[PDB]
Amino acid sequence: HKSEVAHRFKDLGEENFKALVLIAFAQYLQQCPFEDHVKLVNEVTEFAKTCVADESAENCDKSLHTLFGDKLCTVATLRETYGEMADCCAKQEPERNECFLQHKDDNPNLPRLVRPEVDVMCTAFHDNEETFLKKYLYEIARRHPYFYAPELLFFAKRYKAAFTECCQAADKAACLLPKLDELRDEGKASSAKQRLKCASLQKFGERAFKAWAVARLSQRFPKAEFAEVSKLVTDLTKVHTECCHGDLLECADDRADLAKYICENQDSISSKLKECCEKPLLEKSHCIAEVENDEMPADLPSLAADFVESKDVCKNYAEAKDVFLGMFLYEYARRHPDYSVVLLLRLAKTYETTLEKCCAAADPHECYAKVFDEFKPLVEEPQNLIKQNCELFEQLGEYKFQNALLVRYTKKVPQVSTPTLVEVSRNLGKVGSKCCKHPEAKRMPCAEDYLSVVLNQLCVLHEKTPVSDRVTKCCTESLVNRRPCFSALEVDETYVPKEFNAETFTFHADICTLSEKERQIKKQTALVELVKHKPKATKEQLKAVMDDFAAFVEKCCKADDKETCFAEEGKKLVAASQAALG
Ligand SMILES: COc1ccc2c(c1)c(CC(=O)O)c(C)n2C(=O)c1ccc(Cl)cc1
Ligand SMILES: COc1ccc2c(c1)c(CC(=O)O)c(C)n2C(=O)c1ccc(Cl)cc1
Ligand SMILES: CCCCCCCCCCCCCC(=O)O
Ligand SMILES: CCCCCCCCCCCCCC(=O)O
Ligand SMILES: CCCCCCCCCCCCCC(=O)O
Ligand SMILES: CCCCCCCCCCCCCC(=O)O
Ligand SMILES: CCCCCCCCCCCCCC(=O)O
Ligand SMILES: CCCCCCCCCCCCCC(=O)O
Secondary structure, three states, X not given: OOOHHHHHHHHHOHHHHHHHHHHHHHHHOOOOOHHHHHHHHHHHHHHHHHHHHOOOOOOOOOOHHHHHHHHHOOOOOHXXXXXXXXXXXXXXXXXXXXHHHHOOOOOOOOOOOOOOOHHHHXXXXXXXXXXXXXXXXXXXXXXXXXXXXXXXXXXHHHHXXXXXXXXXXXXXXXXXXXXXXXXXHHHHHHHHHHHHHHHHHHHOHHHHHHHHHHHHHHHHOOOOOHHHHHHHHHHHHHHHHHHHHOOHHHHHHHHHHHHHHXXXXXXXXXXXXXXXXXXXXXXXXXXXHHOOOOOOOOOOOOHHHXXXXXXXXXHHHHHOHHHHHHHHHHHHHOOOOOOOHHHHHHHHHHHHHHHHOOOOOOOHHHHOOOOHHHHHHHHHHHHHHHHHHHXXXXXXXXXXXXXXXXXXXXXXXXXXXXXXXXXXXXXXXXXXXXXXXXXXXXXXHHHHHHHHHHHHHHHHHHHHOOOOHHHHHHHHOOOOOHHHHHHOOOOOOOOOXXXXXXXXXXXXXXXXXXXXXXXXXXXXXXXXXXXXXXXXXXXXXXXXXXXXXXXXXXXXXOOOOOOHHHHHHHHHHHHHHHHHOO
């Protein structure tokens, strides 16, 4: 069209426009104050209005990159505040924009955002919704310069829904606090998944990305043909590459194009895309990526037909190795919405290794004849781990289950930091209380989903300050081997126990006035420390100490005088427990 700004303004709407422009500026000029971004937003919005009125008004023909760059180069203290970035303003638009991307600090040194008391949030909310949401939208955006803006907007709307509902509530905190804690964690998940995807595309490359996509796309769109899924995997690959590079505009347009493409060829891809395809521009793709699996054909052939029995397997394979393997994947994925994607990759790899070391053999059909039999153990491993861990989780509750994982992992990698073990073990616990609620056929995909950010999360920390070759081994392993690798870790028999420390096991009355979350973390921390001191303790011996301690808390909190009780019964516990654990 003649004017990009006019166009984007028209189909986005003034409200969404103003919010996205704010997010975009905050992601670049991460250091400028809120008031300064607001002024820029107004100016751009006002400019946009001009172009809507007259497609030919001055500058309305300029591209969004150019306009955006010029306005960015308007900041007077660009050099005094951002220094080197100001030099970007000396380049021509193609490089100017590229120059701006390179200086986008992925993790600046801003103070952590503190959550104020519910009454002050609700009052600030009621007294001025706009500036209240925009300011925090600003705070989140500057800290997460790579968070896809439209999605960051999608979150804002959920935050607003939570205040609207909760601030008019009888018990505001009882309504708000849990909603904010859920929004936060979810916000974290989305952010980490985005970073992980881009990171993985760099290490492993396009082939791995494509395989993962064929598997995922065909599980969701089991009725589409392999050529449609291939088409989609290709476009999808261009979109992620672009979006990872960090250019919002290119990214947003690539996502829009793909979304309309899918919606137009709707009936040819999935029947569950109707809802999503009605929604407005800003939401289409977000919706589609989240869409539920379509129902499969039911009248579907046996894989062993074309991939085992049939002659020409090797002829079809040598003619185009990746396409044939992709075909396998497509065929195997759309018949298994219940398998995790990485499990579908393990099978595809196994199949590949087999065809390679078989198609170069006397009688092919016989060399690879029993390949589907190798799959069995690959499939069962993840299944058995799930049932097993969900069972245990049903018995104990979330908390006691978290404590079990705490003992398990501490004995495996005692070298790891206690606060790290505590955190990882807790999140792992939450993955259990979130996936085990699901019926079997959906558990594995669930776990994979959550378990992957947790494992990467833990791998990054270890990256910083490495403490074990084994963790490093699993962390640098292949995407397909990461989780099985951690699963294979055995008790660390080498580990030399920490010297006892009286302090570490001294508890005061403050443990009675602390919040549930706080109390638990103190107990759990003492637990990791317990195991690090007596790594040979039994589940029996251990459970006995945890039982004494259990009461010890109550017998001292619900006691006439604390302090003393904890120092009196406290001396006892430690002396006794030390003896039981020899
Ligand atoms: C102290 O524990 C946390 C945990 C997660 C946090 C933050 C602080 C902060 C604040 C800070 O950076 O200090 C942000 C921004 N977190 C997110 O990951 C996030 C991302 C997107 C949304 Cl929509 C919501 C939350
Ligand atoms: C629809 O296309 C994809 C492609 C890759 C994906 C995902 C989705 C999802 C999300 C989903 O499972 O739907 C995750 C988590 N991916 C990765 O971890 C990943 C794996 C390998 C590489 Cl090389 C790069 C990224
Ligand atoms: C997502 C952008 C909209 C901003 C609204 C967020 C309001 C809640 C402020 C609290 C943020 C601190 C993060 C947290 O710990 O919950
Ligand atoms: C000045 C540059 C900022 C202009 C705002 C960028 C336009 C955002 C369009 C988002 C389209 C939704 C695409 C999607 O489905 O993800
Ligand atoms: C057009 C379809 C292309 C998909 C290619 C299929 C390749 C499957 C190989 C199994 C995945 C192993 C991943 C890896 O180790 O890099
Ligand atoms: C079920 C969540 C509780 C935590 C225990 C982890 C069990 C899930 C392990 C299965 C991993 C699925 C991904 C994969 O196949 O590698
Ligand atoms: C940094 C110390 C924590 C490391 C603990 C490893 C956690 C691995 C998670 C794998 C979950 C699958 C269940 C399992 O096989 O143990
Ligand atoms: C050397 C032995 C010192 C004894 C220290 C005992 C502390 C163990 C913490 C037990 C926490 C279990 C959690 C719970 O009961 O809910």
